[PDB]
């Protein structure tokens, strides 16, 4: 596509997220920079209002898939860079197991040569000391499949699948993600066939960084299509 | 589960098929028998109401997903096998780009020690000479993806995937497949994680057979998970 | 050039001659390939008499040049590029804890037919382990067929080991060791390492008399988005 | 296996390597931690001996697949945690393309509670302006598979991939990498069937690091293998 070409180098990215979840409001900045050519992206995030009121890895997901690689016989599968510039809308209610859920919508489109990601987020029914405002989650994260179908009909796709967060006590916490993705532009955009992407993520922390914060380096990679 | 014990051996098949397409009504029965060991089935299908008013290639999804091999490490995730033998229903819509589409709905299900599938199909809105009714369609078959998610609020399973069809001057046609499966019995089922089902179906003629009929092999493997 | 040989049907004839612990076979087995869908039906006889081996333990012996190599993979697949005069393909399979079969075979094509004459010798075998006693069962499992270059043979070098099941539950291992090189001068495709998977159903001819065997393959390369 | 055990947290390691390639002689120190649950390797690598007269990304698979994440149905096929903590000897020899080859021995063990992999290499062979010695290579990396065969006869492994190198002007320097694994104790080891390990390697810089230097993450995951 087109906005293909726009991902070819080292693209900086900036993340802004609005968020209330249970009624405590909070904000988070990120910012840094992707390499879709190698499915690579590097970003640290800072919540400006003092300390987050949920986990760290619960917002991963929330927090440009368009940095994705896809390899050359998949281009004409990739969504997400052929809505660009003008970006796409991300819809999500993310439903955690035994546990209340986060809506968000977000905007992902370029503002000048900056990709940006920007969030408003709303969570509800948590319980208070479950394992999100309770803060029983590893700081650490799991290999993800994520499942891609088109939604010709709305003029977007659908995505699907479900995050394993590890908790403290050897167990796991769910988190069923049904998303939408639809472009903003008016221009021709992409619809896929089937298939996924395969995600990793490294979470670690900024050793001259005294705020509440994260640092995420992850690679992600479409798979499954080989007609 | 305890249904997955029904299928640890051979296991007889017969296929039953009322069909309607553009008024054009016919009846189909098949028979045969599946090793879900190797995941492997094989099965002839015979027009018993004369020439098939379709081209045999479209029907094939329509003529048993209980005998997927499931390798041991995602056997948690059989939701086909876990429904047996009380059995569940199978719906699909199935689109025809630029053509008409298929509604079924059959019942899969043991009877005695048959597993026997019933299905009636409508199919509407068929051009006279499109693919289809033109019997424009090569006999042959690709090997596809079988996309599954758990829909939990229906206790059974959402399924996707886009059959291409090969058409006789080099074209593909697809038939886009809308599927729900939904246990028939009160019992507890297994509903998965995301995953899919790797098919590989070959299509060939018994050499003694003058009616019109298919004999069909089928390789199904689940793959895609391994926490 | 030697891909254009393989975009249709083609027929394909194979022949075997067999000694195991001394005891000689022949088999004749024919069919067709389409490497479009890297599927394969083959119809085995032996046409001395009994096969005095199980019919599983011969089918990696009895045309990976039939293979469905994706678009994407393409400039990997040395089989086809070597037709259409062929290549020579060596084996050796080790039983584990049992005796061994050497092949070496000829694939190309004859005419318009595609040809796999194979000459095989068994030795050491017990007569009584799972292989002359007879105790495989009628089935075949799925496997990826492991293939690397070997640039000093402008050829390949290529492994994997058959699981093969035991009539009381157990696997019989079989270890391949396998080597493909040119019969002709003309260039080679060298692969970067990459795996086939491998699908096999094997079934009975209801009104076949003799001692024999059908085959159907799926064959389907993998591994390589580079 | 019981080296396996060693591996379920987070453990520290450290890297030494001492070389000549077409007598230039270097030493490089390095540390960070591995954590195999993830397959996920964070390392720091310093020149200590001033400058590195050859290209950083010529080095990574130099300096632990003992951190490798083997799923839980691969677990027998994991060679490498099995021979610890006595340890393994990995050799290599790595053909630069139309170019020298280095050729190295590493001793990778546990020296009390740290993983340590301590490398001897010899470069021979180089061109002057080459791509290795004329510092041509991009500061970046590709993902790979490598591929892992039991060798019986040595009572460890054989291990052979070829890593694409990206040159400054568009082009691809290879490098073939054939590689050995021997235990250095005399207990019992795992060796595998035939499988891969799929490996993501992210190249960085510290920016208060003034010595030349190279930070590495990488995710390592083993596949292959479903029986």
Redesign the interface.
Known sequence: SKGEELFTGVVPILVELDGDVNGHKFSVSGEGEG?A????L?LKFICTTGKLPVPWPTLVTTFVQCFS?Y???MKRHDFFKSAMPEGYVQERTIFFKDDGNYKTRAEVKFEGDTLVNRIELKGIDFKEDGNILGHKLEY????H?V?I?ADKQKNGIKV???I?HNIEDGSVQLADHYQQNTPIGDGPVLLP??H?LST?S?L?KDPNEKRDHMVL?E?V?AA?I??
Chains 1, 2, 4 share one sequence.
């Open positions: 390499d050519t190698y499915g690579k590097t690689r390899p050359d016989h650490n994260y799991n290999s499949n499942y179908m699907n699948f479900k394993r066939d089937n996924y990793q490294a670690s380096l690679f990679t499954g080989t007609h």
